[PDB]
Design a protein around this ligand. Structure first.
Ligand SMILES: CCCCC[C@H](CC(=O)NO)C(=O)N[C@H](C(=O)N1CCC[C@H]1CO)C(C)C
Ligand SMILES: [Zn+2]
Length: 186
């Protein structure tokens, strides 16, 4: 069972490296790792379990965050009320296309590897199309918008050694870009 002790903190060199592409099929160890990454999110979102193991609630996790420099991510965004939910374990995810229009969460973003909050808007693409493989090597192509698009971009960034605060404007951190879409926290 993965817990906060497995999540490396900001400053660790692995978080700034470029994660390595995965060869398909994945080995048994890599599959178990990806499943455990997803299980971590599940547990983090369970009030009782998260309390018992002092887990910080999260909706996404990238292999580099547990010191594994491989291009694998897990996203677990619960139903927001629209009936839409996102439960994906992706291998070699890549954004193949995206909108020019940007989007951002009004209160900024948080990271499991970053202990203290960092104020500032993180502008990302409002719409993206991702191609990736699933845990069994099959093909997956997602068309995402708004909140989920932001979460997947946050995770993919980890695979390229990019941290959310890298996007924050030094001078005007809370100034939304022209025509950027404000995404309600959901
Ligand atoms: C904008 C991108 C969001 C997805 C990623 C992050 C987790 C992370 O560090 N991934 O690499 C997350 O879940 N962050 C948390 C988060 O913002 N959450 C988790 C559940 C609901 C929501 C609001 O608190 C925080 C509090 C650590
Ligand atoms: Zn993060």
């Amino acid at each position: 069972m993965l817990t906060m002790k497995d999540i490396i903190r900001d400053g660790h060199p692995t978080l700034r490296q470029k994660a390595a592409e995965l060869e398909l099929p994945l080995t048994k160890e890599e599959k178990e790792t990806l499943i455990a990454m997803r299980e971590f999110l599940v547990n983090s979102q369970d009030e009782e379990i998260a309390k018992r193991y002092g887990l910080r609630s999260g909706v996404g996790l990238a292999a580099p965050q547990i010191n594994i420099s491989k291009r694998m991510i897990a996203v677990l965004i619960p139903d927001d009320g629209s009936g839409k939910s996102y439960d994906y374990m992706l291998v070699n995810p890549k954004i193949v296309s995206h909108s020019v229009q940007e989007a951002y969460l009004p209160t900024g973003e948080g990271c499991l590897s970053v202990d203290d909050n960092v104020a500032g808007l993180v502008h990302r693409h409002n719409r993206i199309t991702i191609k990736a493989k699933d845990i069994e090597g099959n093909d997956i192509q997602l068309r995402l918008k708004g909140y989920p698009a932001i979460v997947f971009q946050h995770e993919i960034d980890h695979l390229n050694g990019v941290m959310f605060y890298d996007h924050i404007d030094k001078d005007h951190p809370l100034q939304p870009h022209t025509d950027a879409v404000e995404v309600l926290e959901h």
